[PDB]
Design an enzyme around this catalytic site. Structure first.
Site, short mmCIF file in Angstrom:
data_model
loop_
_atom_site.label_atom_id
_atom_site.label_comp_id
_atom_site.label_asym_id
_atom_site.label_seq_id
_atom_site.Cartn_x
_atom_site.Cartn_y
_atom_site.Cartn_z
N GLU A 19 -7.30 34.45 -2.40
CA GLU A 19 -7.66 35.79 -2.76
C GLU A 19 -9.08 35.80 -3.21
O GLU A 19 -9.48 34.88 -3.96
CB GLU A 19 -6.74 36.34 -3.85
CG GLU A 19 -5.26 36.21 -3.55
CD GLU A 19 -4.38 36.58 -4.75
OE1 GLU A 19 -4.87 37.10 -5.74
OE2 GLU A 19 -3.16 36.46 -4.62
N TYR A 52 3.51 40.01 0.95
CA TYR A 52 3.36 38.62 0.74
C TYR A 52 4.65 37.89 1.11
O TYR A 52 5.76 38.27 0.66
CB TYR A 52 2.95 38.41 -0.73
CG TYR A 52 2.72 36.99 -1.15
CD1 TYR A 52 1.63 36.29 -0.69
CD2 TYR A 52 3.53 36.39 -2.13
CE1 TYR A 52 1.37 35.00 -1.12
CE2 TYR A 52 3.28 35.06 -2.56
CZ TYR A 52 2.20 34.39 -2.03
OH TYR A 52 1.93 33.11 -2.40
N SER A 93 2.85 28.03 -4.15
CA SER A 93 2.00 28.79 -3.19
C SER A 93 0.55 28.34 -3.08
O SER A 93 -0.11 28.72 -2.12
CB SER A 93 2.03 30.28 -3.48
OG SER A 93 3.28 30.80 -3.12
N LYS A 95 -6.11 31.53 -6.63
CA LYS A 95 -4.74 31.50 -6.14
C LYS A 95 -3.79 31.01 -7.23
O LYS A 95 -4.04 29.99 -7.92
CB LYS A 95 -4.63 30.65 -4.91
CG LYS A 95 -3.27 30.61 -4.18
CD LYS A 95 -3.02 31.96 -3.55
CE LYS A 95 -1.68 32.24 -2.94
NZ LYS A 95 -0.76 32.65 -4.05
N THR A 96 -2.65 31.70 -7.34
CA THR A 96 -1.56 31.32 -8.23
C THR A 96 -0.52 30.53 -7.40
O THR A 96 -0.37 30.77 -6.22
CB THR A 96 -0.80 32.51 -8.86
OG1 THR A 96 -0.32 33.40 -7.83
CG2 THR A 96 -1.69 33.27 -9.75
N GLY A 97 0.24 29.68 -8.06
CA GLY A 97 1.41 29.10 -7.36
C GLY A 97 2.54 28.91 -8.29
O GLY A 97 2.32 28.48 -9.41
N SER A 98 3.77 29.19 -7.86
CA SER A 98 4.90 28.85 -8.70
C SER A 98 6.03 28.26 -7.86
O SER A 98 6.31 28.73 -6.75
CB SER A 98 5.44 30.09 -9.49
OG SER A 98 4.59 30.60 -10.53
N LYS A 131 -0.48 27.12 0.23
CA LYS A 131 -1.01 28.01 1.24
C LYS A 131 -2.46 27.82 1.49
O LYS A 131 -2.93 28.08 2.61
CB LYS A 131 -0.72 29.46 0.91
CG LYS A 131 0.79 29.76 0.86
CD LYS A 131 1.04 31.24 0.56
CE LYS A 131 2.54 31.61 0.49
NZ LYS A 131 3.44 30.91 -0.47
B1 LIG Z 1 4.15 31.12 -4.23
O1 LIG Z 1 4.56 29.88 -4.99
C1 LIG Z 1 5.44 31.74 -3.50
N1 LIG Z 1 6.58 32.06 -4.34
C2 LIG Z 1 6.79 32.51 -5.58
C3 LIG Z 1 8.18 32.68 -5.75
C4 LIG Z 1 8.86 33.16 -6.99
O2 LIG Z 1 8.29 33.96 -7.79
O3 LIG Z 1 10.03 32.75 -7.15
N2 LIG Z 1 8.83 32.33 -4.61
N3 LIG Z 1 7.82 31.98 -3.72
O4 LIG Z 1 3.74 31.75 -5.46
P1 LIG Z 1 2.88 33.02 -5.87
O5 LIG Z 1 3.79 34.22 -6.07
O6 LIG Z 1 1.97 33.23 -4.69
O7 LIG Z 1 2.21 32.60 -7.16
#
Ligand SMILES: *[B@]([O])([C]N1[C]=C(C([O])=O)N=N1)OP([O])([O])=O
Length: 358
Positions: A272, A150, A64, A312-315, A67
């Site tokens: 954010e 989200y 994420s 911002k976090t991403g996973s 984004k």
């Molecule tokens: B983004 O990478 C969107 N995201 C998270 C997940 C999950 O938890 O499997 N699927 N899509 O991450 P976030 O939640 O904004 O850190």
């Protein structure tokens, strides 16, 4: 009496390094930028089975955090006059003209307030035709613009429209316009064959090697891959937008503007945003299960703080990311891992480090 680079390395060793043993994380890159000076720390392995160490050439999935690049592309498009955020998607994707989704504006799509778009598309939606059918068939549920949920398809559609307005596929908007305007040389939507040796494996919860799946509107929502030095340069651009040419400068500043709040969290474009100084709990609350996974009624911004910070976090299935910057202290941090660890542990480690650095 201890040079700055060693002080920052000690702090990262104290706060980030013990996460590797704790969560069985094979590799990590942590970077700090302070006043135009870059500090890169690398740990462990990009590929366990290849015995390949993490290093400055290592390419991680941003999830994420992708984004933020989509938001920047939208800001570039807007400030070039190619879109307005009050436009609706039908103006650019003509097959959506006069359908229900064409009542939702670009900003509402970028900031997750359509009122009926969930975290993921249905599994079966894969091709461009199935995506189009999905949005043609969409109908409202909650009042438009009032509920944040989200959503990958929400900012995915935003990304798609932005690409249409710039007459290029979305991958090309990033790889040919936005990455080169930010000065990123090692960031990709599609990692080319000659760079695949640098592309880390992700690791799942049983430490099995995995990489992200292709998906509908994957690139704008979670599809970018980058290296630590590129991410630090991205944080540099956010910390010093005035050092870039007008178009990408206005773009970056566009991503900083808060649009609404959910309690202490201000939703900007991608980013954010928080009133600075921010408590650790405020930053943790931003990524609670309630905020991330469920609908929350938004409120108008009624206290706009003078000084902010942004994160911002991403996973992905096999990778964790966290980026944060504080313009006032001229400082920022990036964490990349090739196994997900709880958002709480990322945010807290970066909080301690950034608050300790002289
Ligand atoms: B983004 O990478 C969107 N995201 C998270 C997940 C999950 O938890 O499997 N699927 N899509 O991450 P976030 O939640 O904004 O850190």
């Amino acid at each position: 009496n201890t040079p700055k680079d060693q002080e920052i390395k000690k702090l990262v060793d104290q706060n980030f390094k013990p996460l590797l043993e704790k969560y069985d994380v094979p590799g990590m890159a942590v970077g700090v930028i302070q006043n135009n000076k870059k500090y890169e720390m690398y740990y462990g392995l990009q590929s366990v089975q290849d015995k390949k160490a993490v290093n400055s050439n290592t390419i991680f999935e941003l999830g994420s955090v992708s984004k933020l690049f989509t938001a920047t592309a939208g800001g570039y498009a807007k400030n070039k006059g190619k879109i307005s955020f009050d436009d609706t998607p039908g103006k650019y994707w003509k097959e959506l003209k006069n359908t229900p989704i064409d009542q939702v504006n670009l900003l509402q799509l970028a900031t997750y307030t359509s009122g009926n778009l969930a975290l993921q598309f249905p599994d079966e939606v894969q091709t461009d035709q199935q995506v189009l059918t999905f949005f043609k068939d969409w109908k409202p549920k909650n009042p438009i613009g009032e509920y944040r949920q989200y959503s990958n398809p929400s900012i995915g559609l935003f990304g798609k429209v932005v690409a249409l307005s710039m007459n290029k596929p979305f991958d090309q908007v990033l790889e040919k316009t936005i990455f080169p305007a930010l000065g990123l040389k090692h960031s990709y939507v599609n990692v080319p064959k000659t760079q695949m040796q640098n592309y880390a494996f992700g690791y799942n919860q049983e430490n099995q090697p995995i990489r992200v799946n292709p998906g509908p509107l994957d690139a704008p929502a979670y599809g970018v891959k980058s290296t630590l030095p590129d991410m630090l340069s991205f944080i540099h651009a956010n910390l010093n937008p005035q050092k870039y040419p007008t178009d990408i400068q206005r773009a970056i500043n566009e991503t900083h503007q808060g649009r609404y709040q959910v309690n202490t969290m201000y939703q900007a474009l991608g980013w954010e945003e928080f009133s600075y100084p921010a408590t650790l709990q405020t930053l943790l609350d931003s990524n609670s299960e309630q905020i991330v996974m469920k609908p929350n009624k938004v409120t108008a911004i009624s206290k706009e703080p003078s000084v902010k910070m942004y994160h911002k976090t991403g996973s992905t299935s096999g990778f964790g990311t966290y980026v944060v910057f504080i313009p006032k202290e001229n400082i920022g941090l990036v964490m990349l891992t090739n196994k997900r660890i709880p958002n709480e542990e990322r945010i807290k480690a970066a909080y301690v480090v950034l608050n300790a650095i002289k």
